Symmetry: C3
């Protein structure tokens, strides 16, 4: 269960970095 929590948090951190990147590309690109 701990590993599953850590993996889900890491996946969300990566998804948020990817979304902020795509937002910046849409706004400025």
């Amino acid at each position: 269960e701990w590993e599953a929590l850590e993996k889900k948090l890491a996946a969300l951190e990566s998804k948020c970095q990817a979304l902020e990147k795509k937002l910046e590309a849409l706004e400025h690109g």
Copy 2:
């Protein structure tokens, strides 16, 4: 303690999925 953190993670997963769909909408007009 654990159950509340899992609930917060599930709500954050729902929120990120919604942001990804909204950002895809904006990329298409």
Copy 3:
């Protein structure tokens, strides 16, 4: 380790809220 997991989730929640508000602005120009 548990406290680190909670502080990281709190930081992700703040970052996703910021993404949400920024996407709302872009949606409107």
